[PDB]
Amino acid sequence: SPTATVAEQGEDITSKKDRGVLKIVKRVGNGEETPMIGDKVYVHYKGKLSNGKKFDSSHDRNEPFVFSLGKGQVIKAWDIGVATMKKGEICHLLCKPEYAYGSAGSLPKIPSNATLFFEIELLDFKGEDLFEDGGIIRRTKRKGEGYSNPNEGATVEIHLEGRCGGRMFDCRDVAFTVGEGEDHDIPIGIDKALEKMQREEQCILYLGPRYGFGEAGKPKFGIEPNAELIYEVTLKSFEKAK
């Protein structure tokens, strides 16, 4: 029985510790960092019911399954389970209905209140390409708490850390207006990325030359024209404009 090991020796990784999701590592991955919130992840999975029958796998699509993590584009068990994996790692998941499909189930193969089994391999994980151009890459350190997002003309209060290829140049808590980061010596990218950020959201930002300081560079910071920068943005508080 392949489901036996994860059912009896599986580590509970749920926040409530209700045994909703149980995990067993089959192959150890490589590296140190686990994929973050919003990060684009590439996987190969195999889903089996409590009776043993397979219902869904990425291999019969003949391609890797890809999604944004933490966004609820998959079942809750995946969002949590994969967020604990390393690159190249294979693991097993025993997921209670509360972290899967629940009392309603899924037509036509998943029954009501079904406990499920999953073997997922994390093939690769990449950052969140904020504008589908690779210009600004986001990797979220911490989830925010916001129903809304700062708009153009929104007054904001953020902590900001900026480095130039490994040399940090900017560190401060700034209060400014969205669209007008220029005045406070702030790249266009930050202002562009704030529009897709929540209250209390920490994230790391990889800026392309187009969203850095541009052909001008930044002399007071000692930054050459069209330089790639790395920022940590912490949106503390904001007020949207009319």
Curated annotation (Swiss-Prot):
Gene Ontology biological process terms, A to Z: chaperone-mediated protein folding; protein folding; response to alcohol; response to bacterium; response to cocaine
Regulation: Inhibited by both FK506 and rapamycin.
Record field: catalytic activity: [protein]-peptidylproline (omega=180) = [protein]-peptidylproline (omega=0)
Modified residues (Phosphoserine): 1
Record-listed E.C. numbers: 5.2.1.8
Enzyme kind, highest EC tier: isomerase
Record's subcellular location: Cytoplasm; Nucleus
Cellular component GO terms, alphabetical: cytoplasm; cytosol; extracellular exosome; membrane; nucleoplasm
Annotated consequence of substituting residue 143 to R: Decreased acetylation; promotes interaction with AKT1 and PHLPP1
Residue ranges of domain PPIase FKBP-type in the record: 30-118, 145-231
Record has Chaperone as a keyword: yes
Effect of residue 16 to Q: Mimics acetylation; impaired interaction with AKT1 and PHLPP1
Sequence positions bearing N6-acetyllysine: 16, 143
Effect of residue 143 to Q: Mimics acetylation; impaired interaction with AKT1 and PHLPP1
GO terms for MF: FK506 binding; heat shock protein binding; peptidyl-prolyl cis-trans isomerase activity; protein-macromolecule adaptor activity
Record PTM text: Acetylation impairs ability to promote interaction between Akt/AKT1 and PHLPP1. Deacetylation by SIRT7 promotes interaction between Akt/AKT1 and PHLPP1, leading to suppress Akt/AKT1 activation. Ubiquitinated, leading to degradation in a proteasome-dependent manner. Deubiquitinated by USP49, leading to stabilization.
The keyword Secreted is annotated on this UniProt entry: no
Keywords: Acetylation, Chaperone, Cytoplasm, Isomerase, Nucleus, Phosphoprotein, Repeat, Rotamase, TPR repeat, Ubl conjugation
Tissues of expression: Widely expressed, enriched in testis compared to other tissues.
Induction of synthesis: By androgen.
Main function: Immunophilin protein with PPIase and co-chaperone activities. Component of unligated steroid receptors heterocomplexes through interaction with heat-shock protein 90 (HSP90). Plays a role in the intracellular trafficking of heterooligomeric forms of steroid hormone receptors maintaining the complex into the cytoplasm when unliganded. Acts as a regulator of Akt/AKT1 activity by promoting the interaction between Akt/AKT1 and PHLPP1, thereby enhancing dephosphorylation and subsequent activation of Akt/AKT1.
Subunit structure, interactors included: Part of a heteromultimeric cytoplasmic complex with HSP90AA1, HSPA1A/HSPA1B and steroid receptors. Upon ligand binding dissociates from the complex and FKBP4 takes its place. Interacts with functionally mature heterooligomeric progesterone receptor complexes along with HSP90 and TEBP. Interacts with NR3C1. Interacts with Akt/AKT1 and PHLPP1; enhancing dephosphorylation and subsequent activation of Akt/AKT1. Interacts with IFI44L; this interaction modulates the kinase activity of IKBKB and IKBKE. Interacts with IKBKB and IKBKE.
Identification of the protein by name: Peptidyl-prolyl cis-trans isomerase FKBP5
